[PDB]
PDB file of C-alpha atoms in Angstrom:
ATOM      1  CA  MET Y   1      14.876  46.431 -46.339  1.00 59.20           C
ATOM      2  CA  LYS Y   2      14.244  43.046 -47.935  1.00 62.27           C
ATOM      3  CA  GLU Y   3      11.190  40.789 -47.947  1.00 61.81           C
ATOM      4  CA  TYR Y   4      11.293  37.164 -46.920  1.00 61.99           C
ATOM      5  CA  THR Y   5       9.091  34.080 -47.052  1.00 63.01           C
ATOM      6  CA  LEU Y   6       9.195  31.454 -44.332  1.00 62.85           C
ATOM      7  CA  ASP Y   7      10.637  28.084 -45.140  1.00 62.23           C
ATOM      8  CA  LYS Y   8       7.896  26.130 -43.387  1.00 63.12           C
ATOM      9  CA  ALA Y   9      10.105  22.994 -43.313  1.00 63.76           C
ATOM     10  CA  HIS Y  10      12.779  24.587 -41.019  1.00 64.78           C
ATOM     11  CA  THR Y  11      10.316  26.825 -39.071  1.00 65.30           C
ATOM     12  CA  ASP Y  12       8.522  25.970 -35.775  1.00 63.71           C
ATOM     13  CA  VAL Y  13       5.789  28.207 -34.345  1.00 63.97           C
ATOM     14  CA  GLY Y  14       6.165  26.672 -30.879  1.00 66.69           C
ATOM     15  CA  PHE Y  15       4.937  26.995 -27.260  1.00 69.26           C
ATOM     16  CA  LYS Y  16       5.471  25.350 -23.839  1.00 66.73           C
ATOM     17  CA  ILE Y  17       3.112  25.395 -20.871  1.00 69.09           C
ATOM     18  CA  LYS Y  18       3.379  23.727 -17.511  1.00 69.30           C
ATOM     19  CA  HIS Y  19       0.597  21.564 -16.104  1.00 67.16           C
ATOM     20  CA  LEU Y  20      -0.114  19.324 -13.137  1.00 65.78           C
ATOM     21  CA  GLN Y  21      -1.347  15.714 -13.399  1.00 66.10           C
ATOM     22  CA  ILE Y  22      -2.672  13.571 -10.586  1.00 64.66           C
ATOM     23  CA  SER Y  23      -1.851   9.845 -10.726  1.00 66.05           C
ATOM     24  CA  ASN Y  24      -1.887   6.854  -8.341  1.00 69.14           C
ATOM     25  CA  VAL Y  25       1.407   5.263  -7.350  1.00 70.62           C
ATOM     26  CA  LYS Y  26       0.460   1.554  -6.961  1.00 71.38           C
ATOM     27  CA  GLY Y  27       2.805  -0.970  -5.278  1.00 72.69           C
ATOM     28  CA  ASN Y  28       3.164  -4.186  -3.308  1.00 77.37           C
ATOM     29  CA  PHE Y  29       5.901  -5.906  -1.314  1.00 76.23           C
ATOM     30  CA  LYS Y  30       7.608  -9.069  -2.682  1.00 79.33           C
ATOM     31  CA  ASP Y  31       8.728 -10.211   0.770  1.00 79.73           C
ATOM     32  CA  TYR Y  32       6.575 -10.491   3.939  1.00 80.17           C
ATOM     33  CA  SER Y  33       5.360 -13.080   6.406  1.00 74.72           C
ATOM     34  CA  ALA Y  34       2.090 -13.689   8.270  1.00 75.26           C
ATOM     35  CA  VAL Y  35       0.473 -15.717  11.031  1.00 74.24           C
ATOM     36  CA  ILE Y  36      -3.246 -16.270  10.211  1.00 74.05           C
ATOM     37  CA  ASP Y  37      -5.673 -17.849  12.743  1.00 75.17           C
ATOM     38  CA  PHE Y  38      -9.215 -18.094  11.437  1.00 75.74           C
ATOM     39  CA  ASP Y  39     -12.361 -20.074  12.444  1.00 77.11           C
ATOM     40  CA  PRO Y  40     -14.585 -21.091   9.510  1.00 80.71           C
ATOM     41  CA  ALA Y  41     -17.386 -22.150  11.914  1.00 86.29           C
ATOM     42  CA  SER Y  42     -17.944 -18.530  13.020  1.00 87.35           C
ATOM     43  CA  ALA Y  43     -16.144 -16.586  10.199  1.00 84.41           C
ATOM     44  CA  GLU Y  44     -13.959 -14.800  12.774  1.00 84.36           C
ATOM     45  CA  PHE Y  45     -10.282 -13.997  12.748  1.00 81.24           C
ATOM     46  CA  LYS Y  46      -8.458 -14.989  15.939  1.00 80.95           C
ATOM     47  CA  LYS Y  47      -4.962 -13.694  15.281  1.00 81.71           C
ATOM     48  CA  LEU Y  48      -3.506 -11.770  12.318  1.00 84.13           C
ATOM     49  CA  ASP Y  49       0.142 -10.690  12.507  1.00 85.02           C
ATOM     50  CA  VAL Y  50       2.007  -9.543   9.411  1.00 83.48           C
ATOM     51  CA  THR Y  51       5.643  -8.430   8.916  1.00 82.73           C
ATOM     52  CA  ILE Y  52       6.686  -6.807   5.722  1.00 81.48           C
ATOM     53  CA  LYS Y  53      10.253  -6.240   4.498  1.00 80.94           C
ATOM     54  CA  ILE Y  54      10.403  -2.629   3.419  1.00 78.86           C
ATOM     55  CA  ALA Y  55      13.413  -3.502   1.180  1.00 80.29           C
ATOM     56  CA  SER Y  56      11.054  -5.655  -0.940  1.00 77.83           C
ATOM     57  CA  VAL Y  57       8.863  -2.723  -2.009  1.00 79.06           C
ATOM     58  CA  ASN Y  58       7.855  -2.718  -5.667  1.00 79.90           C
ATOM     59  CA  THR Y  59       6.245   0.239  -7.398  1.00 80.52           C
ATOM     60  CA  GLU Y  60       7.323  -0.983 -10.843  1.00 78.05           C
ATOM     61  CA  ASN Y  61      10.198   1.523 -11.024  1.00 77.36           C
ATOM     62  CA  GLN Y  62      13.748   0.726  -9.925  1.00 76.76           C
ATOM     63  CA  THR Y  63      14.823   4.288  -8.935  1.00 74.95           C
ATOM     64  CA  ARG Y  64      11.650   4.917  -6.839  1.00 72.31           C
ATOM     65  CA  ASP Y  65      11.909   1.622  -4.967  1.00 71.99           C
ATOM     66  CA  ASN Y  66      15.465   2.642  -3.955  1.00 73.51           C
ATOM     67  CA  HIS Y  67      14.364   6.143  -3.044  1.00 74.70           C
ATOM     68  CA  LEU Y  68      11.616   4.682  -0.725  1.00 76.76           C
ATOM     69  CA  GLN Y  69      14.410   3.061   1.285  1.00 78.73           C
ATOM     70  CA  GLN Y  70      16.039   6.521   2.023  1.00 77.57           C
ATOM     71  CA  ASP Y  71      15.769   8.839   5.097  1.00 76.33           C
ATOM     72  CA  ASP Y  72      12.887  10.824   3.713  1.00 76.68           C
ATOM     73  CA  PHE Y  73      10.723   7.666   3.321  1.00 77.75           C
ATOM     74  CA  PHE Y  74      11.063   4.257   5.023  1.00 79.56           C
ATOM     75  CA  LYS Y  75      14.626   4.593   6.400  1.00 79.80           C
ATOM     76  CA  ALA Y  76      15.105   0.848   5.880  1.00 80.70           C
ATOM     77  CA  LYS Y  77      18.701   0.860   7.232  1.00 78.21           C
ATOM     78  CA  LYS Y  78      17.261   1.784  10.715  1.00 76.23           C
ATOM     79  CA  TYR Y  79      13.686   0.265  10.287  1.00 78.49           C
ATOM     80  CA  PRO Y  80      13.763  -2.680   7.862  1.00 78.70           C
ATOM     81  CA  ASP Y  81      10.289  -3.978   8.518  1.00 78.27           C
ATOM     82  CA  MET Y  82       6.664  -2.888   8.886  1.00 79.27           C
ATOM     83  CA  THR Y  83       4.376  -4.742  11.208  1.00 76.71           C
ATOM     84  CA  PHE Y  84       0.666  -5.203  11.582  1.00 77.60           C
ATOM     85  CA  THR Y  85      -0.778  -6.934  14.667  1.00 75.88           C
ATOM     86  CA  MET Y  86      -4.517  -7.595  14.978  1.00 76.68           C
ATOM     87  CA  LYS Y  87      -6.060  -6.572  18.351  1.00 74.61           C
ATOM     88  CA  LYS Y  88      -9.851  -7.063  17.719  1.00 71.81           C
ATOM     89  CA  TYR Y  89     -11.990  -8.604  14.984  1.00 68.39           C
ATOM     90  CA  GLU Y  90     -15.595  -7.385  15.094  1.00 68.06           C
ATOM     91  CA  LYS Y  91     -17.794  -9.631  12.878  1.00 66.08           C
ATOM     92  CA  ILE Y  92     -20.431  -7.892  10.696  1.00 59.60           C
ATOM     93  CA  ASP Y  93     -21.675 -11.029   8.952  1.00 60.49           C
ATOM     94  CA  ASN Y  94     -19.855 -14.048   7.437  1.00 59.47           C
ATOM     95  CA  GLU Y  95     -18.534 -12.022   4.521  1.00 54.30           C
ATOM     96  CA  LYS Y  96     -17.599  -8.853   6.332  1.00 52.17           C
ATOM     97  CA  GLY Y  97     -15.999  -7.501   9.477  1.00 53.55           C
ATOM     98  CA  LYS Y  98     -14.005  -4.654  10.979  1.00 55.57           C
ATOM     99  CA  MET Y  99     -10.381  -5.523  11.933  1.00 54.29           C
ATOM    100  CA  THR Y 100      -8.507  -3.415  14.491  1.00 49.76           C
ATOM    101  CA  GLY Y 101      -4.725  -3.657  14.783  1.00 47.23           C
ATOM    102  CA  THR Y 102      -1.487  -1.835  15.398  1.00 47.90           C
ATOM    103  CA  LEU Y 103       0.409  -0.751  12.378  1.00 49.46           C
ATOM    104  CA  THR Y 104       4.051   0.142  12.842  1.00 48.74           C
ATOM    105  CA  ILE Y 105       5.826   2.159  10.177  1.00 49.88           C
ATOM    106  CA  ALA Y 106       9.456   3.156  10.860  1.00 48.39           C
ATOM    107  CA  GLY Y 107       9.065   2.752  14.610  1.00 44.13           C
ATOM    108  CA  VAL Y 108       5.826   4.656  14.789  1.00 44.13           C
ATOM    109  CA  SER Y 109       2.756   2.803  15.884  1.00 45.69           C
ATOM    110  CA  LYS Y 110      -0.899   3.577  15.444  1.00 45.31           C
ATOM    111  CA  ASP Y 111      -4.097   1.535  15.743  1.00 45.24           C
ATOM    112  CA  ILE Y 112      -5.926   1.235  12.416  1.00 43.23           C
ATOM    113  CA  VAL Y 113      -9.183  -0.285  11.120  1.00 45.84           C
ATOM    114  CA  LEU Y 114      -9.255  -2.487   8.033  1.00 45.72           C
ATOM    115  CA  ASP Y 115     -12.359  -3.773   6.302  1.00 44.13           C
ATOM    116  CA  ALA Y 116     -12.296  -7.522   6.177  1.00 42.67           C
ATOM    117  CA  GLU Y 117     -14.087  -9.026   3.231  1.00 44.30           C
ATOM    118  CA  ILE Y 118     -14.042 -12.893   3.474  1.00 46.72           C
ATOM    119  CA  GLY Y 119     -14.257 -13.865  -0.193  1.00 47.34           C
ATOM    120  CA  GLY Y 120     -14.293 -17.734   0.030  1.00 46.33           C
ATOM    121  CA  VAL Y 121     -13.887 -20.518   2.581  1.00 48.44           C
ATOM    122  CA  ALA Y 122     -13.351 -23.997   1.317  1.00 48.33           C
ATOM    123  CA  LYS Y 123     -11.849 -27.434   1.664  1.00 49.73           C
ATOM    124  CA  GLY Y 124      -9.318 -27.792  -1.152  1.00 46.78           C
ATOM    125  CA  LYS Y 125      -8.401 -30.268  -3.905  1.00 46.13           C
ATOM    126  CA  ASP Y 126      -6.946 -32.505  -1.119  1.00 47.82           C
ATOM    127  CA  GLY Y 127      -9.585 -32.092   1.664  1.00 47.78           C
ATOM    128  CA  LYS Y 128      -7.367 -29.592   3.607  1.00 46.83           C
ATOM    129  CA  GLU Y 129      -8.739 -26.032   4.229  1.00 49.57           C
ATOM    130  CA  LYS Y 130      -8.367 -22.826   2.202  1.00 48.12           C
ATOM    131  CA  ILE Y 131      -9.513 -19.145   2.539  1.00 50.71           C
ATOM    132  CA  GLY Y 132      -9.539 -16.034   0.434  1.00 51.88           C
ATOM    133  CA  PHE Y 133      -9.980 -12.600   1.987  1.00 52.05           C
ATOM    134  CA  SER Y 134      -9.350  -8.937   1.519  1.00 53.84           C
ATOM    135  CA  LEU Y 135      -8.275  -6.332   4.065  1.00 52.36           C
ATOM    136  CA  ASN Y 136      -8.552  -2.732   3.001  1.00 53.83           C
ATOM    137  CA  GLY Y 137      -8.581   0.702   4.563  1.00 56.97           C
ATOM    138  CA  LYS Y 138      -7.115   4.189   4.384  1.00 57.64           C
ATOM    139  CA  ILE Y 139      -4.254   5.399   6.681  1.00 58.77           C
ATOM    140  CA  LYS Y 140      -2.793   8.906   6.922  1.00 55.18           C
ATOM    141  CA  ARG Y 141       1.013   9.546   6.368  1.00 56.73           C
ATOM    142  CA  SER Y 142       0.655  12.245   9.029  1.00 56.99           C
ATOM    143  CA  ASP Y 143      -0.597   9.808  11.713  1.00 56.86           C
ATOM    144  CA  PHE Y 144       2.667   7.942  11.271  1.00 55.32           C
ATOM    145  CA  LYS Y 145       4.760  11.107  10.946  1.00 54.45           C
ATOM    146  CA  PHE Y 146       5.745   9.378   7.638  1.00 53.80           C
ATOM    147  CA  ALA Y 147       7.668  11.196   4.816  1.00 54.88           C
ATOM    148  CA  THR Y 148       7.025  14.433   6.758  1.00 55.09           C
ATOM    149  CA  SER Y 149       9.322  16.481   4.489  1.00 58.13           C
ATOM    150  CA  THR Y 150       7.125  15.638   1.426  1.00 58.85           C
ATOM    151  CA  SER Y 151       4.131  18.112   1.267  1.00 61.83           C
ATOM    152  CA  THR Y 152       0.625  16.737   1.372  1.00 62.70           C
ATOM    153  CA  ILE Y 153       0.150  18.718  -1.928  1.00 62.63           C
ATOM    154  CA  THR Y 154       2.668  16.630  -3.899  1.00 65.44           C
ATOM    155  CA  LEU Y 155       1.948  13.254  -2.256  1.00 64.62           C
ATOM    156  CA  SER Y 156      -1.411  12.557  -0.741  1.00 66.82           C
ATOM    157  CA  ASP Y 157      -1.700  12.235   3.041  1.00 67.65           C
ATOM    158  CA  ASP Y 158      -3.899   9.166   2.317  1.00 64.80           C
ATOM    159  CA  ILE Y 159      -2.609   5.696   1.564  1.00 65.55           C
ATOM    160  CA  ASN Y 160      -5.076   2.919   0.499  1.00 65.72           C
ATOM    161  CA  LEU Y 161      -4.186  -0.431   1.878  1.00 64.50           C
ATOM    162  CA  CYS Y 162      -5.236  -3.521  -0.020  1.00 62.84           C
ATOM    163  CA  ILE Y 163      -4.146  -6.905   1.390  1.00 65.66           C
ATOM    164  CA  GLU Y 164      -5.491  -9.600  -0.893  1.00 63.07           C
ATOM    165  CA  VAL Y 165      -4.780 -13.078   0.590  1.00 64.27           C
ATOM    166  CA  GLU Y 166      -5.245 -16.723  -0.549  1.00 62.62           C
ATOM    167  CA  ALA Y 167      -4.149 -19.100   2.206  1.00 62.83           C
ATOM    168  CA  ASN Y 168      -4.007 -22.847   2.937  1.00 64.94           C
ATOM    169  CA  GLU Y 169      -4.244 -24.754   6.250  1.00 63.64           C
ATOM    170  CA  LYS Y 170      -0.977 -25.746   8.127  1.00 61.97           C
ATOM    171  CA  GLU Y 171       1.106 -28.950   8.847  1.00 60.91           C
TER     172      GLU Y 171
END
């Protein structure tokens, strides 16, 4: 036998271990339209109808945005848009209310509640009206039979909706 001495410079006492990490995928949609009817006298919404172009999704990642378009997510070839249609606004006070509407994701429709937070009602620079408001709420992938092949372990059943709107009067 012979005796040796490590050469520390070309030696690695190494190890590898697998772990899980939870993180939020955050995203918006670059292209969408809405019809907003609102009465500043009473701080009530009268009509809120939104259409969103699934193709315009943006989760700050090119390959994911594309993947969301595929059969196992949005299926944008067959269902290019998602729609929300308000059915009921129930005023809490002038800053707050409960909005009920029909969300449609890839042809599947469910009534949801969003929390309306009216964050500012004004006449603008020019003397024509503006508003700021938030709509937020949680919907379940499973209520919409959405991405059903992706486990609720990997990707949460819960999606948190945040619609943050600034908006000016018409004509």
